[PDB]
Amino acid sequence: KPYNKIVSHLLVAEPEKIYAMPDPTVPDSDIKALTTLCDLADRELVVIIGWAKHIPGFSTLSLADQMSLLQSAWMEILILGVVYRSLSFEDELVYADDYIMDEDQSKLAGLLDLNNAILQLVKKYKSMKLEKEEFVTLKAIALANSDSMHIEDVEAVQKLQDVLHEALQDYEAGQHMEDPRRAGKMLMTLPLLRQTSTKAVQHFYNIKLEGKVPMHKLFLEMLEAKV
């Protein structure tokens, strides 16, 4: 009756806030906005890597399989954080407490289309009243369900998927008796997340090719393990 332990565990494993810290000495521009976002993402990747070790069974995978899951899922995980932070806002994306993008800024950054897609995810989760418990569980499921082409132990990854799916099912059965299909509805949000991540990875890859925006080692590694 006191709810699911895996969900409780993921809640306490939740990383602290990360600040974007756009350089206050640099003139606003698309380059500044993109540089800021890519730097924030690089720092987020470090946090995500440390966070995944808390997911039951994740650290028992081969390092290769751990890396493969992370390389496929990192942008989904990043986007779901932006989405969750943005739930109490209207038509704005909280990339960080110090970096909230409205429509104007998205246009300036050349991110209007991508940010509108992320706002589509926000709209859906607002309607469903997405809870923190559900957000953290979905991040874990997106990691485990990321469909990497390169998995060594397919059955172990399948087992990780099942443990987290069970946690979602159990949590919903206990907390949301009014909707016996809420777990499934949650899983049904994952395609739009996958779609949006693919849009983001393609976009930032184009930016990587244009060569005008500085990018760090880890972010580049993740971007280049491509899709």
| Contact residues for its own copies, defined by CB under 8 A | 116, 120, 127, 141, 145, 147, 149, 154, 161-162, 165-166, 168-169, 181, 183-185, 187-188, 190-195, 198
**Which residue, 50 or 184, has its beta carbon nearer to its own copies?**
184
- Shortest Cβ 207–its own copies spacing (Å): 18
- Shortest Cβ 61–its own copies spacing (Å): 18
- Shortest Cβ 83–its own copies spacing (Å): 14
**Which residue, 12 or 154, has its beta carbon nearer to its own copies?**
154
- Shortest Cβ 188–its own copies spacing (Å): 5
- Shortest Cβ 209–its own copies spacing (Å): 16
**Which residue, 28 or 113, has its beta carbon nearer to its own copies?**
113
**Which residue, 33 or 193, has its beta carbon nearer to its own copies?**
193
**Which residue, 22 or 81, has its beta carbon nearer to its own copies?**
81
Contact indicator for 103, 91 with CB cutoff of 8 Å:
yes
- Shortest Cβ 80–its own copies spacing (Å): 13
**Which residue, 94 or 117, has its beta carbon nearer to its own copies?**
117
**Which residue, 184 or 214, has its beta carbon nearer to its own copies?**
184
- Shortest Cβ 78–its own copies spacing (Å): 16
What is the spatial distance between Cα 49 and Cα 10, in angstroms, rounded to a whole number? 14
Three-state SS across the chain?
A: CCCCHHHHHHHHCCCCCCCCCCCCCCCCCHHHHHHHHHHHHHHHHHHHHHHHCCCCCHHHCCHHHHHHHHHHHHHHHHHHHHHHHCCCCCCCEEEECCEEECHHHHHHHCCHHHHHHHHHHHHHHHHCCCCHHHHHHHHHHHHHCCCCCCCCCHHHHHHHHHHHHHHHHHHHHHHCCCCCCHHHHHHCCHHHHHHHHHHHHHHHHHHHHHCCCCCCHHHHHHHHCCC
Give buried/exposed letters for 142-180 (b at 16+ CB in 10 A, else e): bbbbbeeeebeeeeebeebbebbbebbbbbbeeebeeee
